[PDB]
Amino acid sequence: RFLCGVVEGFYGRPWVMEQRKELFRRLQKWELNTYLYAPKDDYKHRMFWREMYSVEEAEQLMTLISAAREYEIEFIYAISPGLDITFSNPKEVSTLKRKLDQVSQFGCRSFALLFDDIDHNMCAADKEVFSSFAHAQVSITNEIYQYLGEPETFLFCPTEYCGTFCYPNVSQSPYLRTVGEKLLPGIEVLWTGPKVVSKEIPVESIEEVSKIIKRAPVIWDNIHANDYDQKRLFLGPYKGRSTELIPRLKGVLTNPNCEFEANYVAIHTLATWYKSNMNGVRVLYSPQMALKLALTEWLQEFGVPHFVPGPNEKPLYTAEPVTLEDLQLLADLFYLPYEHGPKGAQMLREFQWLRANSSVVSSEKIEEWRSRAAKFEEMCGLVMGMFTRLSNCANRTILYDMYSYVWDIKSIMSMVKSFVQWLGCRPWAFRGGLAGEFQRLLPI
Amino acid sequence: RRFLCGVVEGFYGRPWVMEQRKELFRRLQKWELNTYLYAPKDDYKHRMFWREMYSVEEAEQLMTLISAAREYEIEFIYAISPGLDITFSNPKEVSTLKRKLDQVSQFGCRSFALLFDDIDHNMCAADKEVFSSFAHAQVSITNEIYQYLGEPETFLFCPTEYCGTFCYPNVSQSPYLRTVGEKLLPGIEVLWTGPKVVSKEIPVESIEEVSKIIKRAPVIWDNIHANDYDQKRLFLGPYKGRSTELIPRLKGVLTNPNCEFEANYVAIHTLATWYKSNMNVLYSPQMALKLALTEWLQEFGVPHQFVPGPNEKPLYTAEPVTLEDLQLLADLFYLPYEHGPKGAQMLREFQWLRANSSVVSSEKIEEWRSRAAKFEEMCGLVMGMFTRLSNCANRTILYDMYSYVWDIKSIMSMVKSFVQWLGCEPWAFRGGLAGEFQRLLPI
Numbered sequence: 067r068f069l070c071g072v073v074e075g076f077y078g079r080p081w082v083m084e085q086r087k088e089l090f091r092r093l094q095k096w097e098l099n100t101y102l103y104a105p106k107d108d109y110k111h112r113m114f115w116r117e118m119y120s121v122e123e124a125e126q127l128m129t130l131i132s133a134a135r136e137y138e139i140e141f142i143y144a145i146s147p148g149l150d151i152t153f154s155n156p157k158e159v160s161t162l163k164r165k166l167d168q169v170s171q172f173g174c175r176s177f178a179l180l181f182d183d184i185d186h187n188m189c190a191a192d193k194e195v196f197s198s199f200a201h202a203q204v205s206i207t208n209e210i211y212q213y214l215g216e217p218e219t220f221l222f223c224p225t226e227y228c229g230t231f232c233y234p235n236v237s238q239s240p241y242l243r244t245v246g247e248k249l250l251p252g253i254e255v256l257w258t259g260p261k262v263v264s265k266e267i268p269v270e271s272i273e274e275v276s277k278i279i280k281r282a283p284v285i286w287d288n289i290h291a292n293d294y295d296q297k298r299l300f301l302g303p304y305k306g307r308s309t310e311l312i313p314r315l316k317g318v319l320t321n322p323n324c325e326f327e328a329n330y331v332a333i334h335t336l337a338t339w340y341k342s343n344m345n346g347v348r349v350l351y352s353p354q355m356a357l358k359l360a361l362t363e364w365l366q367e368f369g370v371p372h373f374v375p376g377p378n379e380k381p382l383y384t385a386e387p388v389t390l391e392d393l394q395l396l397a398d399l400f401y402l403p404y405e406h407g408p409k410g411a412q413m414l415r416e417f418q419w420l421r422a423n424s425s426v427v428s429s430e431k432i433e434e435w436r437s438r439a440a441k442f443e444e445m446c447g448l449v450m451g452m453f454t455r456l457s458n459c460a461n462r463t464i465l466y467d468m469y470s471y472v473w474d475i476k477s478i479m480s481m482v483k484s485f486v487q488w489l490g491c492r493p494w495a496f497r498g499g500l501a502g503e504f505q506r507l508l509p510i
Numbered sequence: 511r512r513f514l515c516g517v518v519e520g521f522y523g524r525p526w527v528m529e530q531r532k533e534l535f536r537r538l539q540k541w542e543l544n545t546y547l548y549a550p551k552d553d554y555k556h557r558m559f560w561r562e563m564y565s566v567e568e569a570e571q572l573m574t575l576i577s578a579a580r581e582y583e584i585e586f587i588y589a590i591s592p593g594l595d596i597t598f599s600n601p602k603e604v605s606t607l608k609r610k611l612d613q614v615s616q617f618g619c620r621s622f623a624l625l626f627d628d629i630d631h632n633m634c635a636a637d638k639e640v641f642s643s644f645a646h647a648q649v650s651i652t653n654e655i656y657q658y659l660g661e662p663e664t665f666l667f668c669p670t671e672y673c674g675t676f677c678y679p680n681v682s683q684s685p686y687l688r689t690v691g692e693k694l695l696p697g698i699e700v701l702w703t704g705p706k707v708v709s710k711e712i713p714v715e716s717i718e719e720v721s722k723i724i725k726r727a728p729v730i731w732d733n734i735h736a737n738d739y740d741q742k743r744l745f746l747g748p749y750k751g752r753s754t755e756l757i758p759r760l761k762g763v764l765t766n767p768n769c770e771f772e773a774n775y776v777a778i779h780t781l782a783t784w785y786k787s788n789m790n791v792l793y794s795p796q797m798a799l800k801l802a803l804t805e806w807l808q809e810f811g812v813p814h815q816f817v818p819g820p821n822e823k824p825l826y827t828a829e830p831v832t833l834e835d836l837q838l839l840a841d842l843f844y845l846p847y848e849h850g851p852k853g854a855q856m857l858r859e860f861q862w863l864r865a866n867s868s869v870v871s872s873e874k875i876e877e878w879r880s881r882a883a884k885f886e887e888m889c890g891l892v893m894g895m896f897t898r899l900s901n902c903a904n905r906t907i908l909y910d911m912y913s914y915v916w917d918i919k920s921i922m923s924m925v926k927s928f929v930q931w932l933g934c935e936p937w938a939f940r941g942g943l944a945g946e947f948q949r950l951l952p953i
């Protein structure tokens with residue numbers, strides 16, 4: 067009984083119903099099993115958590131939940147009341163009960179209460195009834211859990227949800243100690259690893275948290291999340307999680323990129339990772355092999371919607387389709403939060419070398435520069451080629467989700483190329499807007 | 511009479527959907543503008559697959575869209591962009607273009623355009639035997655298409671050399687433009703973006719200069735509020751840097767605004783205020799921004815009752831977006847060559863704070879502490895603005911702006927945090943690989 071799949075848990079434009087239903091189809095195809103509904107900015111999930119769904123909204127959520135059932139995917143409805151719930155007010159607890167029972171009437175059997183990303187200070191009234199913030203959360207989570215009939219899946223997201231958020235540390239946290247003692251054993255707890263966006267989730271870090279919350283956690287993995295940096299996108303493989311974690315966890319739910327169609331690799335490789343050690347206890351997964359397996363499959367989606375010129379006539383612009391090597395390049399340029407893929411790292415390293423040795427144009431090492439320059443111009447050329455062929459693909463829906471990222475990298479790479487050519491001889495200047503001018507003044 | 515003023519959907523990336531286009535027509539009418547130019551770079555049958563006829567499904571949507579334009583008294587101009595691919599000398603290829611344009615004509619469209627922007631200047635062998643230059647080639651098919659369609663009242667041509675800096679060797683001596691102005695039939699209008707692609711100013715003398723070589727007044731395709739070229743940028747400042755004296759020297763101004771549809775309230779509203787002011791001293795950009803923002807504000811409380819006690823947790827969602835929030839947001843996402851006053855002021859204060867920061871380690875310590883606290887308050891107003899936007903009832907507007915407002919709030923919080931650090935790990939490597947290449951360019 068392992069919860070593996072996807073949480074729609076990010077800030078910004080949520081996914082629409084058509085996209086969520088298409089997620090369920092992909093999760094089933096790849097032998098995953100769970101979806102957690104938690105879009106930070108879907109209004110009736112968090113900001114207006116008190117408000118019941120309209121008849122129109124009710125119909126859409128019913129339809130969505132029946133679609134999950136049809137694709138053998140567990141639907142878990144989360145609610146986020148912590149910005150403004152008065153925990154001690156039984157009217158307020160009733161309002162929360164009312165909302166979750168409305169969703170229960172749509173056919174949903176699994177639920178979650180989330181208390182992430184709220185400040186830890188209670189109102190006067192709650193400080194008279196509860197001795198700490200943790201007691202307050204645990205009290206209503208426990209009451210809600212039993213009101214719903216102790217459902218087989220019920221998740222709790224702590225305020226201290228990762229190593230670095232734990233005061234003073236994970237193993238001595240008064241907040242976590244109270245959760246692990248008082249939260250009913252049937253309830254699962256969400257955790258993101260040592261950090262919000264964890265480079266690695268070591269097994270010993272999970273032993274440490276497990277003994278204080280007194281269960282194995284479900285991981286809410288933010289490895290492929292991109293709601294925090296407007297320029298970033300993550301198409302690298304699931305990585306930095308040993309397959310030995312699987313027996314030490316209740317699940318992994320990935321919180322992937324905002325742009326729905328960018329999550330093919332993110333979700334596909336997660337499925338490859340889970341499947342590789344589905345039945346372990348106490349070298350099964352290769353990230354690089356999994357990326358390749360995912361990109362080969364993704365490629366087939368690009369040629370699917372969602373005159374022959376003479377010897378001396380202008381040839382078709384549109385003739386060349388996207389190739390596996392284009393997607394390999396794109397993925398290496400938009401790889402992972404703490405690492406670029408091999409080609410990106412290599413281009414970056416070559417450009418730094420070229421620039422730092424550029425004064426040698428002005429005798430032996432000139433042929434080193436010219437040859438390295440030309441090899442670098444070719445690589446920039448492949449980035450423009452990749453953009454050009456993407457731009458011409460039949461799957462417009464995929465193109466539109468990626469577009470502004472692919473344009474950006476192509477655009478910058480063309481400008482870098484142009485600069486290396488300029489080294490070999492000797493309109494949009496405030497790049498990044500106001501935000502960018504403040505960044506340039508910070509340390510790096 | 512007969513000045514084309516309105517909006518061109520002419521940008522790179524996700525086009526607008528039909529629901530948004532129809533809502534544009536309603537806004538253009540409200541504000542007394544009159545024209546829409548359909549030219550979305552990446553709508554596949556506009557440019558890349560310009561040869562392909564619309565499907566039955568696609569045809570029905572365009573018919574519906576064109577009827578909606580007619581209902582809102584907006585002229586619908588269909589553009590097509592064949593220049594990536596077209597063999598100009600091949601009459602099969604000319605016929606294919608004719609076929610597509612008469613398909614659109616059958617949807618009820620009476621106005622058209624051929625665009626040759628952003629294509630390389632080199633012809634194929636076969637075209638170089640028939641035409642002596644690139645301009646002759648374009649002008650030949652534009653002329654043939656124009657007369658096949660019965661010399662329609664509105665027909666636009668977009669030149670390859672569409673701005674001062676694109677003209678070889680300069681605007682007044684260009685062999686490309688000379689040929690256009692001589693040979694392009696007089697009934698045809700020509701598009702122009704000013705001295706540059708994104709022009710800070712469009713001076714009157716620059717328009718006299720281009721007018722005498724193309725031998726007409728141009729229609730301006732204005733990119734002042736375009737944002738398809740920098741993913742961090744958004745433009746909510748007012749229409750600015752074009753004298754009202756241009757209006758009698760032009761056939762029109764079509765603005766090519768931000769990709770995010772709901773961000774173009776100010777862009778289009780102030781353009782309308784500018785055109786109306788000298789339709790036949792008159793226009794203040796700052797006054798127009800204010801007029802536009804006060805109208806936009808009313809949209810935020812419209813979709814597209816617990817009362818907490820004295821000592822209970824107050825509602826998070828209680829405070830609505832204010833005019834002063836939108837004034838701040840606009841100044842943070844103002845214009846391509848200028849930030850609005852508040853942004854410039856915050857930037858200037860932060861630079862001063864950082865450059866004098868060694869004074870915490872006697873007289874001008876109180877200058878720093880006082881200036882620091884005044885700066886922390888301003889960063890606080892940015893977070894307030896984000897927070898209230900995040901709670902607004904018009905979710906459609908929120909989602910278009912979201913990632914920009916999150917970004918500025920996020921950076922401003924980090925700057926604040928840094929000023930506090932000057933007194934008493936997950937997203938430091940900001941901007942990915944693109945950003946690391948930028949940091950190495952000269953700036």
Ligand SMILES: CCNC1=N[C@@H]2[C@@H](O)[C@H](O)[C@@H](CO)O[C@@H]2S1
Pocket residue numbers: 075076077106182183223227256257258262286288291292293294321
């Ligand atoms: C335990 C889950 N709580 C969290 N809340 C946030 C999510 O909404 C974001 O998408 C994620 C990445 O930016 O960062 C934190 S992780």
Ligand SMILES: CCNC1=N[C@@H]2[C@@H](O)[C@H](O)[C@@H](CO)O[C@@H]2S1
Pocket residue numbers: 520521522551627628668672701702703707731733736737738739766
């Ligand atoms: C009127 C000449 N054509 C032009 N083609 C491009 C447009 O598609 C872009 O939106 C604009 C701003 O990036 O830059 C040029 S202007």
